[PDB]
Design a protein around this nucleic acid. Structure first.
Length: 88
DNA sequence: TGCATCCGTGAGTCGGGTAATAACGGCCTGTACGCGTCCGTTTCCGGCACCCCAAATGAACCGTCCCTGGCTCCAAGGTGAACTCTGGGCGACGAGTGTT
């Protein structure tokens, strides 16, 4: 319990409430189970059927789950300049 | 007391974006939203107290911008004659020519 609560409260650059992290992890887990079972990836409507909630909220959860990237990671094929040198 | 052993700077110039996990009820509250009701406002229907206001309805009316009246005093239309061409009419004279 302590480890999972701390993961939810501290693992992400943008804090996500545990009530939303739980649904994100559950969605990912059962979606990978569905992919393994069915042989293809599950579509958002199919995943919403298991979430017992609407595909709009499924998509909102999906776009919420994304994490930021570093402004200083090298973007070029070689190491020449940082991503921060491309942002207006 | 060297002595290996890290250990800390290079090394120039103007195509984009790639992922994981057991987690699950149950209670609280909190800020935002959703109901029902009541009161200040405000905005007009038609009323005056009358405010009167006024363009439209009778005058003159006098100067003036139109009519009628007569009068000229002149310059244009009517009345002459000639003449210098303008044109036709008259006449004579001369060689190229119809003919046996």
């Amino acid at each position: 319990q302590a480890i999972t609560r701390a993961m939810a409260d501290q693992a992400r650059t943008i804090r996500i409430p545990v009530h939303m992290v739980e649904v994100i992890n559950k969605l990912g887990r059962i979606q990978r189970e569905l992919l393994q079972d069915l042989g293809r990836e599950p579509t958002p409507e199919e995943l919403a059927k298991e979430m017992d909630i609407t595909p709009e909220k499924v998509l909102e959860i999906q776009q919420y789950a994304r994490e930021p990237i570093s402004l200083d990671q090298t973007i070029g094929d070689e190491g020449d300049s940082q991503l921060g040198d491309f942002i207006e």
